[PDB]
Amino acid sequence: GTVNWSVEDIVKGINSNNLESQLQATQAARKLLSREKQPPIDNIIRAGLIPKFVSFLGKTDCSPIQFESAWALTNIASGTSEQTKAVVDGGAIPAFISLLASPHAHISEQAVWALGNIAGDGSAFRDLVIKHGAIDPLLALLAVPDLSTLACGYLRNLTWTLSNLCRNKNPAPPLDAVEQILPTLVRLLHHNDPEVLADSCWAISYLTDGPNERIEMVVKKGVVPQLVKLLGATELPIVTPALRAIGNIVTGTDEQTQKVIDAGALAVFPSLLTNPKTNIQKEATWTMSNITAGRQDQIQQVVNHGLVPFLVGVLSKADFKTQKEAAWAITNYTSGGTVEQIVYLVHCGIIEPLMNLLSAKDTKIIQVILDAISNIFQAAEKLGETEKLSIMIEECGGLDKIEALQRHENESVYKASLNLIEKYF
């Protein structure tokens, strides 16, 4: 009855003074915005229908028109930044926040969804949704003794919207809002639904991406053990966000990194560093590079878990981006490690793959590798074995590459290669 309407018919119905005609026209608009392969959002906006839908949001006595207008506005707010801006300019934020308290769960869910889209536009609309006071009601919707009593889709939408209120970082979310949301996020992080877990881990990864004080908030809530556990998950939708969060945390201080190590994260990296998905491997190698840049006892915990052979493996066969992250890990390890640890690195077979990566067309990997070389050589001089290492770099065919690097565009490259070719070779 309201399927395949024209925008002109929808306007005639909404401009009538008949609440039921307006309801049917709004349902027609919703169906047009929720089914058409390319919904006509721009024409709906041009017709001036957003203010009318926003007004319908406030019709407590006609819950159906509330629901239909909320759905239509949700779908308009799901488009371009300009269309979301059109929804916001109609006054929709406070109306949806008021609707969060509806006695009807489908309407409350639709309001949560609309606010999720609005906040997902970016930091400005996120902060505006927060200023209108959405966090209190949203969290009130989860103030139940057991989350399992809530409908799966309801909880999933609430979790995703909260994750969007934690998203984007220029500016980052207000600190008071983060402190107010984090407890509920931990509670969701201990829920059994995989979608809730994935979205909550993504929220944590948002909140851990930035300065060490934000990381300290998250780590003070005591979530690192659960993040490691989820790192062990069988579902990549759960392992990917968890790995992002752990890597972010290890970009912080050595003590936050130590919190990760203590939770048992390293035991998971033999799988992650051999994972069939390139992204998991790359982000695990980046996490490893931020761990090997830590203290010598943390490098020693990397060694004790048997992860140096896996780094050699990644450096030997992997996607080039993963291989570059591995080169970074090696240079950090050599820069901060003892002589015993660097000797162990050489004994594990680092030299040949490190050499083979000097045939690449990226200046930064070349610099990183040559610095790793200088460090390994410096450790060799403390033992008087620099000649052994030079012979080893010659048998793998590396001196030829360093010699060709003697004539390289970038200055640092040829300076480093000349210092090595002259000082050690």
């Binding site: 759905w71 969804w113 997902g120």
Partner: peptide, 9 residues
């Protein structure tokens, strides 16, 4: 990363 915006079909 989850989609920032979602249409309800």
């Amino acid at each position: 990363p989850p989609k920032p915006k979602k249409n309800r079909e």
